[PDB]
Amino acid sequence: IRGDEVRQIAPGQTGNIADYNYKLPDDFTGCVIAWNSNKLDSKVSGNYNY
Amino acid sequence: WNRKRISNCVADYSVLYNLAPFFTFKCYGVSPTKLNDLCFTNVYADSFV
């Protein structure tokens, strides 16, 4: 997911991707780990697979 | 500062939330996800560098 909408995916947080794809429940005991992977995910002239 | 008065209008914070200048949206007293569900008398905005 693009870095603007990484913060959207959270329990009790509303958004476009956060609401229209999957919510996180309010009793979520768990972890979220992120990494900015520009080496593989970013492609020349756009990555249109996703 | 340039204090701008905001009144007599419908405030759509989803436009700001989907906007590209969007970083460190900190809030005191109000949860940022419930700002579309409230009413205010006047809203004062201060813009600076």
Coordinates of all heavy atoms in Angstrom, one line a residue:
Chain A
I1 N 0.9 -1.2 0.0 CA 0.0 0.0 0.0 C 0.9 1.2 0.0 O 2.0 1.2 0.6 CB -1.0 0.0 1.2 CG1 -2.2 -1.0 0.9 CG2 -1.6 1.3 1.6 CD1 -3.0 -0.5 -0.3
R2 N 0.5 2.3 -0.7 CA 1.2 3.6 -0.7 C 1.3 4.2 0.7 O 0.4 3.9 1.5 CB 0.5 4.5 -1.7 CG 0.7 4.3 -3.1 CD 2.0 4.8 -3.6 NE 2.1 4.8 -5.1 CZ 1.7 5.9 -5.9 NH1 1.3 7.0 -5.3 NH2 1.9 5.8 -7.2
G3 N 2.3 4.9 0.9 CA 2.7 5.4 2.3 C 1.7 6.4 2.9 O 1.7 6.6 4.1
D4 N 0.8 7.0 2.1 CA -0.2 7.8 2.6 C -1.3 7.1 3.3 O -1.9 7.5 4.3 CB -0.8 8.7 1.5 CG 0.1 9.8 1.0 OD1 1.0 10.2 1.8 OD2 0.0 10.2 -0.2
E5 N -1.6 5.9 2.8 CA -2.8 5.1 3.3 C -2.3 3.9 4.3 O -3.1 3.1 4.6 CB -3.6 4.5 2.2 CG -4.1 5.6 1.3 CD -3.3 5.8 0.0 OE1 -2.6 4.8 -0.4 OE2 -3.3 6.9 -0.5
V6 N -1.0 3.9 4.6 CA -0.6 2.9 5.6 C -1.1 3.2 7.0 O -1.6 2.3 7.7 CB 1.0 2.8 5.6 CG1 1.5 1.9 6.7 CG2 1.5 2.4 4.3
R7 N -1.2 4.5 7.3 CA -1.7 5.0 8.6 C -3.2 4.8 8.7 O -3.8 4.9 9.8 CB -1.3 6.4 8.8 CG 0.1 6.7 9.4 CD 1.1 6.7 8.2 NE 0.7 7.8 7.2 CZ 1.0 9.0 7.3 NH1 1.7 9.5 8.3 NH2 0.6 9.9 6.4
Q8 N -3.9 4.7 7.5 CA -5.4 4.5 7.5 C -5.8 3.2 8.1 O -6.8 3.1 8.8 CB -5.9 4.7 6.1 CG -5.7 6.1 5.5 CD -6.3 6.2 4.1 OE1 -6.9 5.3 3.6 NE2 -6.1 7.4 3.5
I9 N -5.0 2.1 7.8 CA -5.4 0.8 8.2 C -5.1 0.6 9.7 O -4.0 0.4 10.1 CB -4.7 -0.3 7.4 CG1 -4.9 -0.1 5.9 CG2 -5.1 -1.7 7.8 CD1 -4.4 -1.2 5.0
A10 N -6.1 0.8 10.6 CA -6.1 0.7 12.0 C -7.5 0.5 12.5 O -8.4 0.8 11.9 CB -5.5 2.1 12.6
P11 N -7.6 -0.1 13.7 CA -8.9 -0.3 14.3 C -9.5 1.0 14.8 O -8.8 1.8 15.4 CB -8.7 -1.2 15.5 CG -7.2 -1.1 15.8 CD -6.6 -0.9 14.4
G12 N -10.7 1.3 14.4 CA -11.4 2.5 14.7 C -11.0 3.7 13.9 O -11.3 4.8 14.3
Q13 N -10.3 3.5 12.8 CA -9.9 4.5 11.9 C -10.6 4.4 10.5 O -10.6 3.3 10.0 CB -8.3 4.5 11.7 CG -7.8 5.8 11.0 CD -6.4 6.1 11.4 OE1 -5.8 5.5 12.4 NE2 -5.8 7.1 10.8
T14 N -11.1 5.4 10.0 CA -11.9 5.4 8.8 C -11.1 5.9 7.6 O -10.2 6.8 7.8 CB -13.2 6.3 9.0 OG1 -12.8 7.6 9.3 CG2 -14.1 5.7 10.1
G15 N -11.4 5.4 6.5 CA -10.7 5.8 5.3 C -11.3 5.2 4.0 O -12.5 4.7 4.1
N16 N -10.6 5.2 2.9 CA -11.0 4.5 1.7 C -10.6 3.1 1.7 O -11.5 2.2 1.6 CB -10.5 5.3 0.5 CG -11.1 6.7 0.3 OD1 -12.3 6.9 0.5 ND2 -10.2 7.6 0.0
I17 N -9.3 2.8 1.7 CA -8.8 1.4 1.8 C -9.2 0.8 3.1 O -9.5 -0.4 3.2 CB -7.3 1.4 1.6 CG1 -7.0 2.2 0.3 CG2 -6.8 0.0 1.5 CD1 -5.5 2.2 0.0
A18 N -9.2 1.6 4.2 CA -9.5 1.1 5.6 C -10.9 0.6 5.7 O -11.2 -0.3 6.5 CB -9.1 2.1 6.6
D19 N -11.9 1.2 5.0 CA -13.3 0.9 5.1 C -13.7 0.0 4.0 O -14.5 -1.0 4.2 CB -14.2 2.1 5.2 CG -13.9 2.9 6.5 OD1 -13.4 2.4 7.5 OD2 -14.2 4.1 6.4
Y20 N -13.3 0.2 2.8 CA -13.9 -0.5 1.6 C -13.2 -1.8 1.4 O -13.8 -2.6 0.6 CB -13.7 0.4 0.4 CG -14.5 1.7 0.4 CD1 -14.1 2.8 -0.3 CD2 -15.7 1.8 1.2 CE1 -14.9 4.0 -0.3 CE2 -16.5 2.9 1.2 CZ -16.0 4.0 0.5 OH -16.8 5.2 0.5
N21 N -12.1 -2.1 2.0 CA -11.4 -3.4 1.8 C -11.5 -4.3 3.0 O -12.1 -5.4 2.9 CB -9.9 -3.2 1.4 CG -9.8 -2.6 0.0 OD1 -9.3 -1.5 -0.1 ND2 -10.1 -3.4 -1.0
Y22 N -11.1 -3.9 4.1 CA -11.2 -4.7 5.4 C -10.9 -3.8 6.6 O -10.0 -3.0 6.6 CB -10.2 -5.9 5.4 CG -8.8 -5.6 5.0 CD1 -7.8 -5.2 5.9 CD2 -8.4 -5.6 3.6 CE1 -6.5 -4.9 5.5 CE2 -7.1 -5.4 3.2 CZ -6.1 -5.0 4.2 OH -4.9 -4.7 3.8
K23 N -11.8 -3.9 7.6 CA -11.6 -3.2 8.8 C -10.7 -4.0 9.8 O -10.5 -5.2 9.5 CB -12.9 -2.9 9.6 CG -14.0 -2.4 8.7 CD -13.8 -0.9 8.4 CE -13.8 -0.1 9.7 NZ -15.0 -0.3 10.5
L24 N -10.2 -3.4 10.8 CA -9.6 -4.1 11.9 C -10.5 -4.0 13.1 O -11.0 -2.9 13.4 CB -8.2 -3.5 12.2 CG -7.0 -4.2 11.6 CD1 -5.7 -3.4 11.8 CD2 -6.9 -5.6 12.0
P25 N -10.8 -5.1 13.8 CA -11.7 -5.1 14.9 C -11.1 -4.3 16.1 O -9.9 -4.2 16.2 CB -12.0 -6.5 15.2 CG -10.8 -7.2 14.7 CD -10.3 -6.5 13.5
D26 N -12.0 -3.9 17.0 CA -11.6 -3.1 18.1 C -10.9 -3.9 19.2 O -10.2 -3.3 20.0 CB -12.8 -2.3 18.7 CG -13.3 -1.3 17.7 OD1 -12.5 -0.7 17.0 OD2 -14.6 -1.1 17.7
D27 N -11.1 -5.2 19.2 CA -10.4 -6.1 20.1 C -9.1 -6.7 19.5 O -8.8 -7.9 19.8 CB -11.3 -7.2 20.6 CG -11.9 -8.0 19.5 OD1 -12.4 -7.4 18.5 OD2 -11.8 -9.3 19.6
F28 N -8.5 -6.0 18.6 CA -7.3 -6.6 17.9 C -6.1 -6.6 18.8 O -5.5 -5.5 19.1 CB -7.0 -5.7 16.6 CG -5.8 -6.2 15.8 CD1 -5.8 -7.4 15.3 CD2 -4.8 -5.3 15.7 CE1 -4.7 -7.8 14.6 CE2 -3.6 -5.7 15.0 CZ -3.6 -7.0 14.4
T29 N -5.7 -7.8 19.2 CA -4.5 -8.0 19.9 C -3.5 -8.5 18.8 O -3.6 -9.7 18.4 CB -4.6 -9.0 21.1 OG1 -4.8 -10.3 20.5 CG2 -5.8 -8.6 21.9
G30 N -2.6 -7.7 18.4 CA -1.7 -8.1 17.3 C -0.8 -6.9 16.9 O -0.9 -5.8 17.4
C31 N 0.1 -7.2 15.9 CA 1.1 -6.2 15.5 C 1.0 -5.9 14.1 O 0.4 -6.7 13.3 CB 2.5 -6.8 15.9 SG 2.8 -7.0 17.6
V32 N 1.5 -4.7 13.7 CA 1.6 -4.3 12.3 C 3.0 -3.9 12.1 O 3.6 -3.2 12.9 CB 0.6 -3.2 11.9 CG1 0.7 -1.9 12.7 CG2 0.6 -2.9 10.4
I33 N 3.6 -4.4 11.0 CA 5.0 -4.2 10.6 C 5.0 -3.6 9.2 O 4.3 -4.1 8.3 CB 5.9 -5.4 10.7 CG1 5.6 -6.2 12.0 CG2 7.4 -5.0 10.8 CD1 6.1 -7.7 12.0
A34 N 5.8 -2.6 9.0 CA 5.9 -2.0 7.7 C 7.3 -1.8 7.2 O 8.3 -1.8 8.1 CB 5.2 -0.6 7.7
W35 N 7.5 -1.7 5.9 CA 8.8 -1.4 5.4 C 8.7 -0.7 4.0 O 7.9 -1.2 3.2 CB 9.7 -2.6 5.2 CG 10.9 -2.4 4.3 CD1 11.2 -3.1 3.1 CD2 12.0 -1.5 4.5 NE1 12.3 -2.6 2.6 CE2 12.8 -1.6 3.4 CE3 12.3 -0.5 5.5 CZ2 14.0 -0.8 3.2 CZ3 13.4 0.2 5.3 CH2 14.3 0.1 4.2
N36 N 9.4 0.4 3.8 CA 9.4 1.1 2.6 C 10.3 0.4 1.6 O 11.5 0.6 1.6 CB 9.9 2.6 2.8 CG 9.4 3.5 1.7 OD1 8.7 3.1 0.8 ND2 9.9 4.7 1.8
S37 N 9.7 -0.4 0.7 CA 10.5 -1.2 -0.2 C 10.4 -0.6 -1.6 O 9.5 -1.0 -2.4 CB 10.0 -2.7 -0.2 OG 8.6 -2.7 -0.5
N38 N 11.3 0.4 -1.9 CA 11.3 1.0 -3.2 C 12.1 0.2 -4.2 O 12.0 0.5 -5.4 CB 11.9 2.4 -3.1 CG 11.1 3.3 -2.1 OD1 10.0 3.1 -1.9 ND2 11.8 4.3 -1.6
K39 N 12.9 -0.8 -3.8 CA 13.8 -1.5 -4.7 C 13.1 -2.5 -5.6 O 13.4 -2.6 -6.8 CB 14.9 -2.2 -3.9 CG 16.2 -1.4 -3.8 CD 16.1 -0.3 -2.7 CE 15.7 -0.9 -1.3 NZ 15.7 0.1 -0.3
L40 N 12.0 -3.1 -5.1 CA 11.3 -4.2 -5.8 C 9.9 -3.8 -6.2 O 9.5 -4.1 -7.3 CB 11.3 -5.4 -5.0 CG 12.6 -5.9 -4.4 CD1 12.4 -7.1 -3.4 CD2 13.6 -6.3 -5.5
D41 N 9.2 -3.1 -5.4 CA 7.8 -2.8 -5.7 C 7.7 -1.7 -6.7 O 6.8 -1.7 -7.6 CB 7.0 -2.4 -4.4 CG 7.1 -3.5 -3.3 OD1 7.5 -4.6 -3.6 OD2 6.9 -3.2 -2.1
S42 N 8.5 -0.6 -6.6 CA 8.5 0.5 -7.5 C 9.1 0.0 -8.9 O 10.2 -0.5 -8.9 CB 9.2 1.7 -7.0 OG 10.6 1.5 -6.9
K43 N 8.5 0.3 -10.0 CA 8.9 -0.1 -11.3 C 9.0 1.2 -12.2 O 8.4 2.2 -11.9 CB 8.1 -1.1 -11.9 CG 8.2 -2.5 -11.3 CD 7.4 -3.6 -12.0 CE 7.4 -4.9 -11.3 NZ 6.4 -5.9 -11.9
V44 N 9.7 1.0 -13.3 CA 9.8 2.1 -14.3 C 8.5 2.3 -15.0 O 7.9 1.3 -15.4 CB 11.0 1.8 -15.2 CG1 11.4 3.1 -16.0 CG2 12.2 1.3 -14.5
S45 N 8.1 3.6 -15.2 CA 6.8 4.0 -15.8 C 5.6 3.3 -15.1 O 4.7 3.0 -15.8 CB 6.9 3.7 -17.3 OG 6.7 2.3 -17.6
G46 N 5.7 3.2 -13.8 CA 4.5 2.7 -13.0 C 4.5 1.2 -13.0 O 4.8 0.5 -13.9
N47 N 4.0 0.7 -11.8 CA 3.7 -0.7 -11.6 C 2.2 -0.8 -11.6 O 1.5 -0.5 -10.6 CB 4.3 -1.2 -10.3 CG 4.4 -2.7 -10.2 OD1 4.0 -3.4 -11.1 ND2 5.0 -3.2 -9.1
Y48 N 1.7 -1.4 -12.7 CA 0.2 -1.4 -12.9 C -0.4 -2.8 -12.5 O -1.6 -3.1 -12.8 CB -0.1 -1.1 -14.3 CG -0.1 0.4 -14.7 CD1 1.0 1.2 -14.5 CD2 -1.2 1.0 -15.4 CE1 1.0 2.5 -14.8 CE2 -1.2 2.3 -15.7 CZ -0.1 3.1 -15.5 OH 0.0 4.4 -15.8
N49 N 0.4 -3.7 -11.9 CA -0.1 -5.0 -11.5 C -1.0 -4.9 -10.4 O -2.0 -5.6 -10.3 CB 1.1 -6.0 -11.2 CG 2.0 -6.2 -12.4 OD1 1.7 -5.7 -13.5 ND2 3.1 -6.9 -12.2
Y50 N -0.7 -4.0 -9.4 CA -1.5 -3.9 -8.2 C -2.7 -3.1 -8.5 O -2.7 -2.1 -9.2 CB -0.7 -3.3 -7.1 CG 0.4 -4.2 -6.5 CD1 1.7 -4.1 -6.8 CD2 0.0 -5.3 -5.7 CE1 2.7 -4.9 -6.3 CE2 0.9 -6.1 -5.2 CZ 2.3 -5.9 -5.5 OH 3.2 -6.8 -5.0
Chain B
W1 N 0.5 36.0 12.1 CA -0.2 35.0 11.5 C -1.4 35.6 10.7 O -1.8 36.8 10.9 CB -0.8 34.0 12.5 CG 0.2 33.1 13.2 CD1 1.5 33.0 12.9 CD2 0.0 32.2 14.2 NE1 2.2 32.1 13.7 CE2 1.2 31.6 14.5 CE3 -1.2 31.8 14.9 CZ2 1.3 30.6 15.5 CZ3 -1.0 30.8 15.9 CH2 0.2 30.2 16.2
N2 N -2.0 34.8 9.8 CA -3.2 35.1 9.0 C -4.3 34.3 9.6 O -4.5 33.2 9.2 CB -2.9 34.9 7.6 CG -2.4 36.1 6.8 OD1 -2.2 37.2 7.4 ND2 -2.0 35.9 5.6
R3 N -5.1 34.9 10.5 CA -6.2 34.2 11.1 C -7.4 34.3 10.1 O -7.8 35.4 9.8 CB -6.6 34.8 12.4 CG -8.0 34.5 12.9 CD -8.0 34.4 14.4 NE -7.4 33.2 14.9 CZ -7.4 32.8 16.2 NH1 -8.0 33.5 17.1 NH2 -6.7 31.7 16.5
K4 N -7.9 33.2 9.7 CA -9.0 33.1 8.7 C -10.2 32.5 9.5 O -10.1 31.5 10.1 CB -8.6 32.3 7.5 CG -9.7 32.2 6.5 CD -9.1 32.0 5.1 CE -10.2 31.9 4.0 NZ -11.1 33.0 4.0
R5 N -11.3 33.2 9.3 CA -12.6 32.8 10.0 C -13.4 31.9 9.0 O -13.5 32.3 7.9 CB -13.4 34.0 10.4 CG -14.8 33.7 10.9 CD -15.7 34.9 10.6 NE -17.1 34.7 11.1 CZ -17.4 34.9 12.4 NH1 -16.5 35.4 13.3 NH2 -18.6 34.6 12.8
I6 N -13.8 30.8 9.5 CA -14.6 29.8 8.8 C -16.0 29.7 9.5 O -16.0 29.4 10.7 CB -13.9 28.5 8.7 CG1 -12.6 28.6 7.9 CG2 -14.8 27.5 8.1 CD1 -11.8 27.4 7.9
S7 N -17.0 30.0 8.7 CA -18.4 30.1 9.3 C -19.4 29.9 8.2 O -19.1 30.2 7.0 CB -18.7 31.3 10.1 OG -18.7 32.5 9.2
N8 N -20.6 29.5 8.5 CA -21.8 29.4 7.6 C -21.5 28.5 6.4 O -21.8 28.8 5.3 CB -22.3 30.7 7.2 CG -23.0 31.5 8.3 OD1 -24.0 31.0 8.9 ND2 -22.4 32.7 8.7
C9 N -20.9 27.3 6.7 CA -20.6 26.4 5.6 C -20.5 25.0 6.2 O -20.4 24.8 7.4 CB -19.3 26.8 4.9 SG -17.8 27.0 6.0
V10 N -20.5 24.0 5.3 CA -20.4 22.6 5.6 C -18.9 22.2 5.4 O -18.3 22.4 4.4 CB -21.2 21.7 4.7 CG1 -21.0 20.3 5.0 CG2 -22.7 22.1 4.9
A11 N -18.3 21.7 6.5 CA -16.9 21.4 6.6 C -16.7 19.9 6.2 O -17.0 19.1 7.0 CB -16.3 21.8 7.9
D12 N -16.1 19.7 5.1 CA -15.8 18.3 4.7 C -14.3 18.0 4.9 O -13.4 18.4 4.2 CB -16.1 18.1 3.2 CG -17.5 18.5 2.8 OD1 -18.3 18.8 3.8 OD2 -17.9 18.6 1.6
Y13 N -14.1 17.3 6.0 CA -12.7 17.0 6.4 C -12.2 15.8 5.6 O -11.0 15.5 5.7 CB -12.6 16.7 7.9 CG -12.8 17.9 8.8 CD1 -14.0 18.4 9.2 CD2 -11.7 18.7 9.2 CE1 -14.2 19.5 10.0 CE2 -11.8 19.8 9.9 CZ -13.1 20.2 10.3 OH -13.2 21.3 11.1
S14 N -13.0 15.1 4.9 CA -12.6 14.0 4.0 C -11.8 14.5 2.9 O -10.9 13.8 2.3 CB -13.8 13.2 3.6 OG -14.7 14.0 2.8
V15 N -12.1 15.7 2.4 CA -11.3 16.4 1.4 C -9.8 16.6 1.9 O -8.9 16.3 1.1 CB -11.9 17.7 0.9 CG1 -11.1 18.4 -0.1 CG2 -13.3 17.4 0.4
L16 N -9.7 17.0 3.1 CA -8.3 17.2 3.7 C -7.7 15.8 3.9 O -6.5 15.6 3.8 CB -8.4 17.9 5.0 CG -8.2 19.4 5.0 CD1 -9.2 20.2 4.3 CD2 -8.1 19.9 6.5
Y17 N -8.5 14.8 4.3 CA -8.0 13.5 4.6 C -7.5 12.7 3.4 O -6.5 12.0 3.4 CB -9.0 12.6 5.3 CG -8.5 11.4 6.0 CD1 -7.9 11.5 7.3 CD2 -8.6 10.2 5.4 CE1 -7.4 10.4 7.9 CE2 -8.1 9.0 6.1 CZ -7.5 9.1 7.3 OH -7.1 8.0 8.0
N18 N -8.1 13.0 2.2 CA -7.7 12.4 1.0 C -6.7 13.3 0.2 O -6.3 13.0 -0.9 CB -8.9 12.1 0.1 CG -9.9 11.2 0.8 OD1 -9.6 10.6 1.8 ND2 -11.2 11.3 0.3
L19 N -6.4 14.5 0.8 CA -5.5 15.4 0.1 C -4.1 15.0 0.2 O -3.7 14.2 1.1 CB -5.7 16.8 0.7 CG -5.5 18.0 -0.3 CD1 -6.5 17.9 -1.4 CD2 -5.7 19.3 0.4
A20 N -3.3 15.4 -0.8 CA -1.9 15.1 -0.8 C -1.0 15.8 0.2 O -0.1 15.2 0.8 CB -1.3 15.2 -2.3
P21 N -1.3 17.2 0.5 CA -0.6 17.7 1.7 C -1.3 17.2 3.0 O -2.1 17.9 3.5 CB -0.8 19.2 1.5 CG -1.9 19.4 0.6 CD -1.8 18.2 -0.4
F22 N -0.9 16.1 3.4 CA -1.5 15.4 4.6 C -0.4 14.7 5.4 O 0.1 13.6 5.0 CB -2.5 14.4 4.2 CG -3.2 13.8 5.3 CD1 -4.2 14.5 6.1 CD2 -3.0 12.5 5.7 CE1 -4.8 13.9 7.2 CE2 -3.6 11.9 6.7 CZ -4.5 12.6 7.5
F23 N 0.1 15.4 6.5 CA 1.1 14.8 7.4 C 0.9 15.3 8.8 O 0.6 16.5 9.0 CB 2.5 15.1 6.9 CG 3.1 14.1 5.9 CD1 3.1 14.4 4.6 CD2 3.7 13.0 6.4 CE1 3.7 13.5 3.7 CE2 4.2 12.0 5.5 CZ 4.2 12.3 4.1
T24 N 1.1 14.4 9.8 CA 1.1 14.7 11.2 C -0.2 15.4 11.7 O -0.2 16.5 12.2 CB 2.3 15.5 11.6 OG1 2.2 16.8 11.2 CG2 3.6 14.9 11.0
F25 N -1.3 14.8 11.4 CA -2.6 15.4 11.7 C -2.9 15.1 13.2 O -3.6 14.2 13.6 CB -3.7 14.7 10.8 CG -5.0 15.5 10.8 CD1 -5.1 16.8 11.3 CD2 -6.1 14.9 10.2 CE1 -6.3 17.4 11.3 CE2 -7.4 15.6 10.2 CZ -7.4 16.8 10.7
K26 N -2.3 16.0 14.0 CA -2.4 15.8 15.4 C -3.7 16.6 15.9 O -4.0 17.6 15.3 CB -1.2 16.3 16.2 CG -1.0 15.7 17.6 CD 0.1 16.5 18.3 CE 1.4 16.5 17.5 NZ 2.4 17.4 18.1
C27 N -4.3 16.1 16.9 CA -5.5 16.8 17.4 C -5.6 16.7 18.9 O -5.3 15.7 19.5 CB -6.8 16.2 16.8 SG -7.0 16.5 15.0
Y28 N -6.1 17.8 19.5 CA -6.3 17.9 21.0 C -7.7 18.1 21.3 O -8.3 19.0 20.8 CB -5.5 19.0 21.6 CG -4.0 19.0 21.2 CD1 -3.5 19.7 20.1 CD2 -3.1 18.3 22.0 CE1 -2.2 19.7 19.8 CE2 -1.7 18.3 21.7 CZ -1.3 19.0 20.6 OH 0.1 19.0 20.4
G29 N -8.3 17.2 22.1 CA -9.7 17.3 22.5 C -10.7 16.6 21.6 O -11.7 16.1 22.1
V30 N -10.4 16.5 20.3 CA -11.3 15.9 19.3 C -10.6 14.7 18.6 O -9.4 14.9 18.3 CB -11.8 16.9 18.3 CG1 -12.9 16.3 17.4 CG2 -12.3 18.2 18.9
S31 N -11.2 13.6 18.5 CA -10.7 12.5 17.7 C -10.7 12.9 16.2 O -11.7 13.5 15.8 CB -11.4 11.2 17.9 OG -10.9 10.2 17.2
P32 N -9.7 12.6 15.5 CA -9.6 13.1 14.1 C -10.6 12.3 13.2 O -10.9 12.9 12.1 CB -8.2 12.8 13.6 CG -7.7 11.7 14.6 CD -8.4 12.0 15.9
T33 N -11.1 11.2 13.6 CA -12.0 10.4 12.7 C -13.5 10.8 12.9 O -14.3 10.4 12.2 CB -11.9 8.9 13.0 OG1 -12.2 8.6 14.3 CG2 -10.5 8.5 12.7
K34 N -13.8 11.6 14.0 CA -15.2 12.0 14.3 C -15.5 13.4 13.9 O -16.5 13.9 14.2 CB -15.4 11.7 15.7 CG -15.0 10.3 16.2 CD -15.9 9.7 17.2 CE -15.6 8.2 17.4 NZ -16.6 7.6 18.3
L35 N -14.5 14.1 13.3 CA -14.7 15.5 13.0 C -15.8 15.8 11.9 O -16.3 16.9 11.9 CB -13.4 16.1 12.5 CG -12.4 16.5 13.5 CD1 -10.9 16.4 13.0 CD2 -12.6 17.9 14.0
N36 N -16.2 14.8 11.2 CA -17.3 14.9 10.3 C -18.7 14.7 11.0 O -19.7 14.9 10.3 CB -17.2 13.9 9.1 CG -15.9 14.0 8.4 OD1 -15.5 15.0 7.9 ND2 -15.1 12.9 8.5
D37 N -18.7 14.4 12.3 CA -19.9 14.1 13.0 C -20.2 15.2 14.1 O -21.0 14.9 15.0 CB -19.8 12.7 13.6 CG -19.8 11.6 12.6 OD1 -20.1 11.9 11.4 OD2 -19.4 10.5 13.0
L38 N -19.6 16.4 14.0 CA -19.8 17.4 15.0 C -20.2 18.7 14.3 O -20.2 18.8 13.1 CB -18.5 17.6 15.8 CG -18.0 16.4 16.6 CD1 -16.6 16.7 17.1 CD2 -19.0 16.1 17.7
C39 N -20.5 19.7 15.2 CA -20.9 21.0 14.8 C -20.1 22.0 15.6 O -19.8 21.8 16.8 CB -22.4 21.3 14.9 SG -23.4 20.6 13.6
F40 N -19.7 23.1 15.0 CA -18.9 24.2 15.6 C -19.5 25.5 15.3 O -20.2 25.7 14.3 CB -17.5 24.2 15.2 CG -16.8 22.8 15.1 CD1 -16.7 22.2 13.8 CD2 -16.4 22.1 16.2 CE1 -16.1 20.9 13.7 CE2 -15.9 20.9 16.1 CZ -15.7 20.3 14.8
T41 N -19.3 26.5 16.2 CA -19.8 27.8 16.0 C -19.0 28.5 14.9 O -19.5 28.9 13.9 CB -19.8 28.6 17.3 OG1 -18.5 29.1 17.6 CG2 -20.2 27.7 18.5
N42 N -17.7 28.8 15.2 CA -16.8 29.3 14.2 C -15.5 28.5 14.3 O -15.1 28.1 15.4 CB -16.6 30.8 14.4 CG -17.8 31.6 14.4 OD1 -18.3 32.0 13.4 ND2 -18.4 31.8 15.6
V43 N -14.8 28.4 13.2 CA -13.6 27.6 13.1 C -12.5 28.6 12.7 O -12.6 29.2 11.6 CB -13.6 26.4 12.2 CG1 -12.3 25.7 12.1 CG2 -14.7 25.5 12.7
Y44 N -11.4 28.8 13.4 CA -10.4 29.7 13.1 C -9.1 29.0 12.6 O -8.7 28.1 13.3 CB -10.1 30.6 14.3 CG -11.2 31.6 14.6 CD1 -12.0 31.5 15.7 CD2 -11.4 32.7 13.7 CE1 -13.0 32.4 15.9 CE2 -12.4 33.6 14.0 CZ -13.2 33.5 15.1 OH -14.2 34.4 15.3
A45 N -8.6 29.4 11.5 CA -7.5 28.7 10.9 C -6.3 29.6 10.9 O -6.4 30.8 10.5 CB -7.8 28.2 9.4
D46 N -5.1 29.1 11.2 CA -3.9 29.9 11.2 C -2.8 29.2 10.4 O -2.5 28.0 10.6 CB -3.4 30.0 12.7 CG -4.3 30.9 13.5 OD1 -5.0 31.7 13.0 OD2 -4.3 30.6 14.7
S47 N -2.3 29.9 9.4 CA -1.4 29.3 8.4 C -0.1 30.0 8.5 O 0.0 31.3 8.4 CB -1.9 29.3 7.0 OG -2.2 30.7 6.6
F48 N 1.1 29.3 8.6 CA 2.4 29.9 8.8 C 3.4 28.9 8.4 O 3.1 27.8 8.0 CB 2.6 30.5 10.2 CG 2.1 29.5 11.3 CD1 2.9 28.6 11.9 CD2 0.8 29.6 11.8 CE1 2.5 27.8 12.9 CE2 0.3 28.7 12.7 CZ 1.2 27.8 13.3
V49 N 4.7 29.3 8.5 CA 5.8 28.5 8.0 C 6.8 28.4 9.2 O 7.3 29.4 9.7 CB 6.5 29.1 6.8 CG1 7.8 28.3 6.5 CG2 5.6 29.1 5.6

